[PDB]
Enzyme design. Structure first.
Site, PDB file in Angstrom:
ATOM      1  N   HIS A  41       0.757  -1.535  -0.421  1.00 20.28           N
ATOM      2  CA  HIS A  41       0.100   0.054  -0.028  1.00 20.28           C
ATOM      3  C   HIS A  41       0.976   1.007  -0.089  1.00 20.28           C
ATOM      4  O   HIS A  41       0.205   2.394  -0.414  1.00 20.28           O
ATOM      5  CB  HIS A  41      -0.949   0.000   1.203  1.00 20.28           C
ATOM      6  N   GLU A  72       0.761  -8.424   0.320  1.00 22.13           N
ATOM      7  CA  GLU A  72       1.194  -7.389   1.661  1.00 22.13           C
ATOM      8  C   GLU A  72       2.151  -6.634   1.992  1.00 22.13           C
ATOM      9  O   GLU A  72       2.953  -5.905   2.092  1.00 22.13           O
ATOM     10  CB  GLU A  72       0.060  -6.924   1.977  1.00 22.13           C
ATOM     11  N   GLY A 146       1.164   5.496  10.511  1.00 29.25           N
ATOM     12  CA  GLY A 146       2.956   6.097  10.889  1.00 29.25           C
ATOM     13  C   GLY A 146       3.150   4.924  11.186  1.00 29.25           C
ATOM     14  O   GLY A 146       5.077   4.890  10.970  1.00 29.25           O
TER      15      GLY A 146
END
Ligand code: SVU
Length: 182
Positions: A41, A72, A146
């Site tokens: 992503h 991923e 984050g």
């Protein structure tokens, strides 16, 4: 504080860089030579910032399993003038559960962050932001934004990279030795 944090620190101080894409700042694990990983992503392009230096991406491969299901993990080869310490011998060979893991993060916003996340479950399937995803590890810590790309370790093993959370649990994509054979 203890041998878990000792191993995590050893990995962070030599095998991480700060990666910036158009989708944000990420902790990025260097694995060997000029090869690193980041969550898919992050949308890596032809150029990426590495410790705020403009860097050409020589190759980027979004991994999927042999059922063509998202993992991923994106493997990136960077046009950098320096190699990473080779840490492939700390990667597990098989899918597994773990005790007493640490999640470590290093960004502009979260420098020198280490979280004792505890027991890690081989969770397997997860619908991650709408995308069917396999080989997911789960830990019972309320991870926030984050921390993506943060490194999940046990003493002696580098087992995954943080890719998501649901406010109560955090999720990582497995790292397996077989991803990085050459
Ligand atoms: C702003 C204070 N603070 C508490 C936890 C964190 C980072 N998330 C682990 N930041």
């Amino acid at each position: 504080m203890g041998p878990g944090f000792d191993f995590a620190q050893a990995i962070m101080k030599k095998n991480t860089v700060i990666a910036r894409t158009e989708k944000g700042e990420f902790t990025m694990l260097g694995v060997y030579d000029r090869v690193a990983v980041i969550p898919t992503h992050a949308s890596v392009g032809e150029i990426i910032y590495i410790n705020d230096v403009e860097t050409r991406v020589l190759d980027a491969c979004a991994l999927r399993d042999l059922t063509d299901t998202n993992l991923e993990i994106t493997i990136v080869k960077l046009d950098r003038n320096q190699k990473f310490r080779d840490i492939r011998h700390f990667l597990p060979r098989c899918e597994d559960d773990y005790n007493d893991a640490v999640l470590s993060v290093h960004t502009s916003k979260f420098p020198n962050m280490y979280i004792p996340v505890g027991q890690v479950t081989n969770y397997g399937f997860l619908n991650l932001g709408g995308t069917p995803t396999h080989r997911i590890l789960m830990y019972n810590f309320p991870t926030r934004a984050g921390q993506c790309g943060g490194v999940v370790t046990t003493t002696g093993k580098v087992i995954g990279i943080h890719v998501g959370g649901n406010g109560a649990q955090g999720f990582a994509a497995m790292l397996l030795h077989s991803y990085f054979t050459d």
